[PDB]
Amino acid sequence: GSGPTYCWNEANNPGGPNRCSNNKQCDGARTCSSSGFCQGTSRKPDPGPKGPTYCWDEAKNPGGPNRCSNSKQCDGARTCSSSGFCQGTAGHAA
């Protein structure tokens, strides 16, 4: 959960990616319970970045890409049609 971009690799499992696994399971802004990064938010590909964030590049489809479609394996500046996974763009904040 660093910033629009953490890009929690989100790649390393079928359930989900590595299986959203840090920073509330995602990386991209969260804060731990120590603010570290495990509580808070993963760069809600909110109406700000819209790209300047980014992790994957193809998991929407319901039976082909990394698979998400709903919100569990998409990229970083997207919004699963609107929950923060697949629909937006993907672009990473360096």
Swiss-Prot record:
Q: Which UniProt keywords apply?
A: Antiviral protein, Disulfide bond, Lectin
* Residues of the signal peptide: none
Coiled-coil stretches: none
**Segment SD1: which positions?**
3-41
Database matches in InterPro entries = SVN-like_dom
- GO BP terms: regulation of defense response to virus
Taken from the UniProt record, the cysteine pairs bridged by disulfide bonds within this chain are: 7-55, 20-32, 26-38, 68-80, 74-86
Entry's Pfam families?
Answer: SVN
List, in alphabetical order, the Gene Ontology terms for molecular function in this entry: polysaccharide binding
Decide whether keyword Disulfide bond is in the record: yes
Stretch list, region SD2? 51-89
Where does the source fall among the domains of life?
Bacteria
Q: What role is this protein assigned?
A: Has strong anti-HIV activity against T-tropic strains of HIV-1 and weaker activity against M-tropic strains of HIV-1. Inhibits HIV-1 fusion and infection of CD4 LTR beta-gal cells in vitro. Inhibits fusion of HIV infected CEM-SS cells with uninfected CEM-SS cells, and fusion of HIV-1 Env expressing HL2/3 cells with CD4 LTR beta-gal cells. Binds to HIV gp120, HIV gp160 and to a lesser extent HIV gp41. Binding to HIV gp120 is glycosylation dependent.
Q: What is this protein called?
A: Scytovirin
